[PDB]
């Protein structure tokens with residue numbers, strides 16, 4: 257059934273699973289035409305497919321060429337997402353295929369179910385959680401590879417850097433969600449915090465700064481304040 | 494005109510014959526039903542006074558044999574049987590008819606309701622859905638489950654309707670996932686029509702038979718089959734014009750006949766609103782939409 261507050265720890269057991277987020281697959285800019293009408297221009301997007309136990313991120317770049325000549329693009333985007341996820345599963349050896357795929361939006365359920373009819377043993381699940389994966393394009397290196405792509409491409413990341421060397425997957429997932437919740441609520445502040453230290457470095461092979469344990473506490477604390485804060489500035493509390 | 498004589502009526506029962514019905518009191522002098530129109534299937538059904546639970550009945554065609562009803566006090570129901578001795582049947586029937594102990598199938602001569610509800614229903618096909626090949630008539634009741642329901646327990650007592658499943662490999666061609674799910678024409682026209690049913694008449698016949706088992710017996714599994722076969726057509730962008738026109742007539746008379754106070758349970762909101770207002774065929778069911786909107790506008 258649905259993934260929610262009450263079965264949260266299942267993500268970190270030893271059953272392979274993936275989250276699929278489709279919020280950044282079909283991205284547009286809205287602009288005015290010479291005649292004073294409105295039109296859209298597509299820009300490159302990505303599918304965010306994440307193993308929450310390992311932090312492996314299969315970032316499928318959706319190049320704007322895939323929309324050429326197509327109608328009903330918001331609907332196609334969900335099927336295109338489902339098609340790329342089921343291609344990914346088919347490319348993996350059986351023992352690496354997920355036992356569950358959890359979609360962050362319910363509108364992906366039918367598209368993925370249909371593309372996965374060949375895999376009746378993979379449970380396709382929604383969730384009641386308001387996960388902040390849409391903010392993945394606020395991570396500079398992710399945003400950069402998506403915008404630079406000139407063709408369809410799959411890029412692999414570990415969204416946890418080397419954190420699992422020191423913390424558990426439960427705690428790494430929780431840091432990830434805080435960072436992204438922060439980025440979603442106030443990207444400028446969020447980034448000011450992370451890059452607040454002129455002496456700190458993000459490794460070439462990483463997405464986030466190389467914080468010490470103690471520095472992560474400070475950072476995580478500052479990201480909590482931000483999320484509470486913007487909650488005031490937005491609600492006047 | 495044919496006759497379904499009754500040996501007697503030992504328990505109080507409500508008897509249904511096609512869309513008609515009447516009450517018989519315990520040990521009332523009653524020896525069955527006469528003047529039944531030849532050329533159509535018929536259904537004679539039962540609801541005991543003491544247990545409105547379980548409505549059961551028999552689908553039959555009088556052209557296929559001489560049939561009668563006798564209550565069985567061991568199994569506790571009115572059972573259909575075949576009299577193979579034709580002369581004896583005639584002597585027995587003629588005797589009940591002269592003593593005026595039979596009710597008359599009460600067909601108004603303007604009325605084509607029963608024809609319209611059974612136009613494509615054929616006893617040979619019913620007997621493939623209801624497997625019991627040693628009888629020429631077919632028993633159905635409220636509790637019988639469908640082959641698809643058993644996939645989701647006694648196979649011999651099941652309703653072997655054609656399995657429709659919109660999220661199945663049968664329904665979905667590899668590489669046409671989105672196409673085949675949003676426009677089921679391939680599944681309707683090639684898989685089901687050309688492949689399984691062979692023609693639209695057999696399709697409509699199963700559809701009409703499912704509805705009638707729903708209406709007369711509250712056989713949930715039939716209700717599900719009926720809606721599924723409607724929805725498969727409505728969700729197909731490409732349907733022969735003749736099938737659409739015939740479908741409109743078929744459903745019009747089903748909705749016209751449905752007991753008003755059963756529409757809440759039977760009629761599936763999602764399927765009808767989709768079929769009438771969102772689907773490819775939203776503009777092709779004028780008669781059905783007009784009767785639905787004037788009779789059950791709550792549901793929409």
Ligand SMILES: Cn1cnn(Cc2ccc(F)c(Cl)c2)c1=O
Nearest residue numbers: 498499500560561562576582585
């Ligand atoms: C009179 N008696 C009583 N039972 N049997 C068989 C039977 C009975 C009633 C009928 F309506 C028919 Cl068709 C046949 C019989 O010979």
